[PDB]
Amino acid sequence: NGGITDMLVELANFGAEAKKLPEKIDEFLATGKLRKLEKIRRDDTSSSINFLTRVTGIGPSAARKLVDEGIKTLEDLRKNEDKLNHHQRIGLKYFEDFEKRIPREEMLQMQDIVLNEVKKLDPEYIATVCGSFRRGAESSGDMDVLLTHPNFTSESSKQPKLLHRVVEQLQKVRFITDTLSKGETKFMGVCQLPSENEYPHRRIDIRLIPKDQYYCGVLYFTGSDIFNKNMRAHALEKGFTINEYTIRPLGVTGVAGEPLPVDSEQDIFDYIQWRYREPKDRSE
Ligand SMILES: Nc1ncnc2c1ncn2[C@H]1C[C@H](O)[C@@H](COP(=O)(O)OP(=O)(O)OP(=O)(O)O)O1
């Protein structure tokens, strides 16, 4: 029966009473589940792994041994402080708040303060929060401001202090509450707007780019993927390759190139002829 064909599909996942012995019931159709397999229970230990990654900083290597450190839960780690760095220390301490998307109300808010801070700093800067909020969206998960200055480019490749100047600052103001890393061309960290009678902290990463590699790197973080995936294409279609870093005329056999200069966003869109496909509509 259709009836006996189903418990069937359930076992494999997991003469008549002979191929049988070759246990079962309506017990398969019913479901044991995770418990039924309890292999599956060891499989859920894979729920350790990915859950464990959920914690900040910890990447492939990290959790695996950590969990391996007999460990697997919120609280394992909570005890297991010693077992990680300043990074991951945080993305635990916060992590929870970490799984709660912001409100573009606040965005604009920091959106302000950020660019508001820089502006206090110098005029030659230019910053821009990008990623999602840009696209219009009601909900991000990480701030992401992109900076640059004329006194800097892909040629100098040496000006940490620059990017450094503002990080210091955003902290000054008590905004950037903590800090994951730091390494000249990149900052990633934890902010938080201001009070008076408290909001959760949000992941930000300040980047910087030569005032040249700027733009391309710009289009790229506004994504999406697919979006930046549908585009790499067409340009290539029309024979052009692009990357996080830049626009390049192709080649005879694939390998070939050279960076065209790049004033604004729309200049590339010019390159592979397409319409200035505004952010909002930048989904695919
Ligand atoms: N820790 C992470 N590891 C890998 N990919 C991540 C991680 N966090 C986010 N992503 C990727 C996959 C998510 O679907 C996407 C969204 O990240 P998020 O920081 O939230 O950006 P975003 O919220 O503005 O967009 P969305 O979340 O929609 O994808 O980014």
Swiss-Prot record:
GO CC entries: cytoplasm; microtubule; nucleus; protein-containing complex; spindle microtubule
Reactions mediated catalytically:
DNA(n) + a 2'-deoxyribonucleoside 5'-triphosphate = DNA(n+1) + diphosphate; a 5'-end 2'-deoxyribose-2'-deoxyribonucleotide-DNA = (2E,4S)-4-hydroxypenten-2-al-5-phosphate + a 5'-end 5'-phospho-2'-deoxyribonucleoside-DNA + H(+); 2'-deoxyribonucleotide-(2'-deoxyribose 5'-phosphate)-2'-deoxyribonucleotide-DNA = a 3'-end 2'-deoxyribonucleotide-(2,3-dehydro-2,3-deoxyribose 5'-phosphate)-DNA + a 5'-end 5'-phospho-2'-deoxyribonucleoside-DNA + H(+)
Q: Which GO terms describe its biological process?
A: apoptotic process; base-excision repair; base-excision repair, gap-filling; DNA damage response; DNA replication; double-strand break repair via nonhomologous end joining; homeostasis of number of cells; immunoglobulin heavy chain V-D-J recombination
Return the EC number: 2.7.7.7, 4.2.99.-, 4.2.99.18
- What positions does the entry give for Na(+) 2 binding? T53, V55, I58
Q: Is Ubl conjugation found in the keyword set?
A: yes
Q: Where in the cell is it found?
A: Nucleus; Cytoplasm
User: Where on this chain does K(+) 2 bind?
Assistant: T53, V55, I58
Positions binding K(+) 1 in this chain are: K19, L21
- Binding-site positions, Na(+) 1: K19, L21
N6-acetyllysine modifications at: K24
Q: What is its main location?
A: nucleus
| Active-site positions on this chain | K24 (nucleophile)
**Amino-acid positions noted as binding Mg(2+) 1 in the UniProt annotation, renumbered to this chain:** D142, D144
Please give the annotated consequence of changing D142 to E/S: Loss of activity
Domain statement: Residues 239-252 form a flexible loop which appears to affect the polymerase fidelity.
Please report the name of this protein according to its UniProt entry.
Answer: DNA polymerase beta
Instruction: Show the taxonomic lineage.
Output: Eukaryota, Metazoa, Chordata, Craniata, Vertebrata
